[PDB]
């Protein structure tokens, strides 16, 4: 059972 | 090559007299992806590669 994509709300702008 | 002003004619094949047509200039849509790299986030929304 391969791992799932991590739930990333992420964001925007400069990082 | 000289431009539309030099040769301002659109030659449509056949007889199209009396027909309604729709003329416009092509819109150049561009989207370049960012490089498909692994993205991770911390406990907050900050991203990492």
């Amino acid at each position: 059972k391969k791992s799932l994509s991590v739930a990333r709300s992420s964001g925007g702008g400069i990082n | 090559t000289a431009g539309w002003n030099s040769d301002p004619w659109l030659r449509l094949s056949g007889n199209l007299e009396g027909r309604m047509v729709y003329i416009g200039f092509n819109i150049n849509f561009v989207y370049e992806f960012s490089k498909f790299l692994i993205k991770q986030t911390a406990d907050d929304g900050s991203t990492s590669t």
Partner: protein, 99 residues
């Protein structure tokens, strides 16, 4: 040159640099009673909008701010944003070209 443009709760204005214009969002700080602040919404694209911004506009209904600069007259620079629960959920910087 560009009058600050107010959309909803925010006012957008230009701050020119040596070669490219920084666009800032003027807003009220949430916690403090009487502190206002400016946030650089072009921080991730500092070298995008050339100096010479003379028009700042946009639509509240469509949720965008548009910048016209005479440095690159052929482009309309578009700032697409979304606000959910006092949070910038979308920050999209792009331009439109017509020739």
């Amino acid at each position: 040159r560009a009058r600050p443009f107010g959309i909803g709760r925010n006012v957008y204005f230009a701050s020119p640099r040596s070669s490219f214009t920084s666009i800032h969002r003027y807003y009220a700080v949430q916690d403090v009673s009487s502190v206002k602040n400016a946030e650089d919404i072009t921080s991730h694209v500092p070298n995008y909008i050339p100096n010479g911004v003379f028009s700042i506009c946009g639509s509240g209904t469509e949720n965008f701010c548009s910048v016209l600069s005479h440095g690159d007259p052929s482009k309309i620079f578009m700032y697409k944003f979304l606000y959910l629960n006092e949070e910038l959920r979308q920050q999209s910087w792009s331009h439109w070209d017509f020739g």
